[PDB]
Amino acid sequence: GHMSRSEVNMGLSSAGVAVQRSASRVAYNQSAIDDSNNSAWDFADGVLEQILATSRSRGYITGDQYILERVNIVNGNGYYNLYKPDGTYLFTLNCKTGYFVGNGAGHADDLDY
């Protein structure tokens, strides 16, 4: 919610933030993460802004006060975690589908991998 429509970004800086990474539903695979050149990391168009628009609606975040992070590549469905400005894990989303998965008592909510 800065440019106009369809942006896709991390919205806040996860630098110094106390972000919950161990709370992630998908593996933080730094090899796929560093493989960032993948289109597995290209969500689509305002797809993130969707999930984010949703996140705020859900009560996960506000505006672009979110902290998104690259996590994993499954099938090329590059998964991104959404965090609070405090780094609090909200969910793991699929960039390629704009789907998003929640977390619980150590179970696959939407997961399969």
UniProtKB/Swiss-Prot annotation:
Record note on disruption phenotype: Deletion mutant exhibits a variety of aberrant cell shapes and sizes, is more sensitive to heat stress and shows lower survival after exposure to oxidative stress. Mutants show severe cell division defects, with cells dividing asymmetrically, generating daughter cells of unequal size. Cells have mispositioned division septa and form grape-like clusters. They exhibit severe alterations of FtsZ ring morphology and localization. FtsA and other cell division proteins are also mislocalized.
Stretch of the intact protein here? 355 to 464 of 464
Q: What does this protein do?
A: Early cell division protein that marks the future cell division site and supports proper FtsZ ring positioning.
Q: Which residues, by range, are in coiled-coil regions?
A: none
Q: What is known of its domains?
A: The N-terminal domain is required for interaction with FtsZ. The C-terminal domain efficiently binds peptidoglycan and is required for septal localization. Both domains are required for MapZ cellular function.
Mind telling me what this protein is named? Mid-cell-anchored protein Z
Q: How does it assemble?
A: Interacts with FtsZ.
Modified how: Phosphorylated on Thr residues by StkP. Both phosphorylated and non-phosphorylated forms of MapZ are required for proper Z-ring formation and dynamics. Phosphorylation probably occurs during the predivisional stage.
Q: Say which family it is in.
A: Belongs to the MapZ family.
